[PDB]
Design a protein around this ligand. Structure first.
Ligand SMILES: *[C@@H]1O[C@H](CO)[C@@H](O[C@@H]2O[C@H](CO)[C@@H](O[C@@H]3O[C@H](CO[C@H]4O[C@H](CO[C@H]5O[C@H](CO)[C@@H](O)[C@H](O)[C@@H]5O)[C@@H](O)[C@H](O)[C@@H]4O)[C@@H](O)[C@H](O[C@H]4O[C@H](CO)[C@@H](O)[C@H](O)[C@@H]4O)[C@@H]3O)[C@H](O)[C@H]2NC(C)=O)[C@H](O)[C@H]1NC(C)=O
Ligand SMILES: *[C@@H]1O[C@H](CO)[C@@H](O[C@@H]2O[C@H](CO)[C@@H](O[C@@H]3O[C@H](CO[C@H]4O[C@H](CO)[C@@H](O)[C@H](O)[C@@H]4O)[C@@H](O)[C@H](O[C@H]4O[C@H](CO)[C@@H](O)[C@H](O)[C@@H]4O)[C@@H]3O)[C@H](O)[C@H]2NC(C)=O)[C@H](O)[C@H]1NC(C)=O
Ligand code: HEM
Ligand code: HEM
Ligand code: PLM
Ligand code: PLM
Ligand code: NAG
Ligand code: NAG
Ligand code: MG
Ligand code: MG
Lengths: 234, 234
């Protein structure tokens, strides 16, 4: 009960990111999800997950674009479509055809059914999930955006769940299904289930080869103009 | 003299922006040009120029992308091509064929020679300068990037000099050449010359119509892909 999980209430701003929502649900970020700066994210990700400042500064400062404040966000601000938030999410619907903010079990069923027969999700299953989620958006969302940039972000996010939710060695690029499923469905660290914070720092160099391998295995191709333009403010 | 002008020394960081360079040269920002946050920019723009937080937050957080630090920059970081820094600057060269950081009088000649006959720069002369600057980059720089985004940034920068360096009413969209020329060439507030800080707040809604008019008068068209992708980190 240092950093216990407590379910968020109506007082609590939450976003499209399970990583940050979980940190807030354990009080590594403010539980109300407000007034969050990049230094706060940096410290929270290190304390909660052993994720290092390199990736969190890079993504954090892009995230700051989504608010109207000088140096902070509310977590829900991160839903802003086209800054980071993208189509073919693992657990959220595409904004053109649904709710791009909240966990969605119908969408999540693709990830939950992946790597059949195994007790982990891994790099090859993550790649197949990405391929299938993108195929679903291509089929059902006429306004889909799929670019080099969104594809990179998507593989990054798969690498993030694989490493932060791992069972001992984030380099392996695999994580127990029981941990990953709690993380997405509950936005809770699966401590009773047996998860522990990584004892290896999770950095850009550690992630990079995992990201590239997921991409390579996903049989990806760009759509439309393939323009990597982001939304720069609300 | 609470904020006297002093020349930057060899170790004081300066960037491609006359606005921020000038604030630093008067001590409204740190004279060394380092460890500058968005709140510092907001307060310095207000004190120095009566520019309000809406525009400075917007632009400031984009500028924060250009460093590796969590919530600050050095001014020189802002030279990072393709975040904000762009080709067809009013006083710098294009990075592919020259120095995109320091004031260059040969580039500035176009602006300095504009609105012939008159003692002010105005919206129509700013538009003609933009047109001519972009023509120069189209002719001489094979790697030119010219998009909806760069063109908007350019018109915004024109509107910034026109309003901040005005003879006291920024809504007029005109500024004494004597003040504007000092601002660019020296990065100094032209106080001895008779300028004073606007008594009218300079805001997004004050700027916006000026920006659109400059763009409308500049006979602009896009080049290439017309992709507004920015560089998101060094
Ligand atoms: C992410 O995890 C996935 C899943 O764990 C990893 O993929 C698996 O890798 C293991 C190797 O570590 C492979 O095991 C080998 O399987 C060989 C037989 O493969 C064929 O048969 C499989 C079974 O038949 C299935 O049919 C359908 C599938 O359509 C199923 O629904 C049905 O229930 C049957 O199960 C097929 O799934 C597969 O495609 C092949 O057709 C065995 O020959 C091999 O045995 C050798 O090795 C053993 C030790 O490893 C040894 O004890 C034996 O003596 C023998 O020498 C071994 O068991 C799995 O095939 C493979 N599964 C998949 C789905 O690819 C994946 O590598 C991992 N990724 C990363 C990056 O880590
Ligand atoms: C940005 O700043 C520029 C420069 O100041 C402005 O451009 C000038 O705008 C004024 C309008 O105010 C123009 O002045 C007008 O010029 C007309 C044409 O003048 C030339 O041609 C005639 C022959 O046809 C000659 O007689 C003359 O000497 C010039 O060679 C004149 O016909 C107009 O004269 C009438 O109006 C004035 C009062 O304005 C009366 O004094 C006259 O008696 C007569 O009734 C007038 O002089 C000037 O031409 C513009 N210059 C240029 C280069 O375009 C931009 O408008 C301004 N932009 C913005 C957005 O504010
Ligand atoms: C701290 C470690 C972090 C972890 C483990 C993590 C994990 C993830 C995961 C797995 C997703 C994918 C959700 C999905 O596809 O349904 C995601 C999405 C997202 N993350 Fe993070 N994240 C972290 C940090 C960040 C940071 C620092 C930011 C920005 C400040 C951020 C912003 C987002 C956004 C905007 C999305 C939504 C993208 C989308 O699916 O459309 N995350 N995150
Ligand atoms: C405070 C009021 C400001 C004023 C009056 C101002 C003014 C200007 C002007 C006139 C230019 C054009 C220089 C040229 O084309 O040669 C410029 C360029 C630039 N400004 Fe500012 N600016 C201000 C604030 C900002 C802020 C807040 C940022 C980012 C944190 C910023 C970043 C830049 C950059 C990167 C350039 C270079 C663009 C280029 O010409 O390639 N400026 N500024
Ligand atoms: C080898 C460099 C990769 C190519 C360029 C990628 C630089 C921008 C990456 C944006 C990272 C944002 C993803 C953070 C994870 C999240 O979204 O939860
Ligand atoms: C105020 C007009 C621009 C706002 C339109 C939204 C698209 C992003 C705008 C970027 C504004 C950047 C201005 C920076 C100031 C500077 O460059 O000197
Ligand atoms: C917290 O965030 C609110 C908006 O959510 C903002 O107005 C305010 O700046 C923040 N509180 C502070 C700085 O104490
Ligand atoms: C610059 O322009 C030429 C086309 O004229 C191209 O071949 C080259 O790749 C470009 N350089 C960069 C860095 O894009
Ligand atoms: Mg999404
Ligand atoms: Mg430039």
């Amino acid at each position: 009960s240092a950093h216990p999980w407590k379910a968020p209430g109506p007082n609590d701003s939450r976003g499209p990111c399970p990583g940050l929502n979980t940190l807030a649900n354990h009080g590594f970020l403010p539980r109300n999800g407000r007034n969050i700066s990049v230094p706060m994210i940096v410290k929270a990700g290190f304390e909660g997950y052993n994720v290092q400042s390199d990736i969190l500064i890079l993504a954090g400062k892009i995230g700051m674009l989504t608010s109207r404040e000088a140096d902070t966000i509310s977590l829900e601000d991160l839903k802003l479509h086209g800054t980071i938030e993208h189509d073919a999410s693992l657990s959220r619907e595409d904004v053109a055809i649904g709710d791009n903010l909240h966990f969605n079990e119908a969408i999540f069923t693709t990830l939950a059914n992946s790597n059949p027969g195994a007790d982990v999700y891994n790099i090859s299953s993550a790649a197949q999930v990405q391929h299938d989620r993108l195929a679903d958006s291509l089929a059902r969302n006429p306004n889909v955006t799929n670019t080099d940039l969104t594809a990179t972000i998507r593989s990054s996010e798969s690498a993030f769940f694989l490493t932060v939710m791992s069972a001992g060695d984030p380099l392996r690029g695999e994580a127990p299904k029981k941990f990953v499923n709690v993380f997405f469905r509950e936005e809770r660290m699966p401590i009773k289930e047996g998860w522990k914070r990584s004892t290896t720092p999770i950095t850009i160099p550690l992630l990079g080869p995992i990201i590239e391998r997921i991409t390579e295995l996903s049989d990806w191709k760009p759509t439309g103009d393939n323009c990597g333009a982001i939304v720069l403010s609300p």
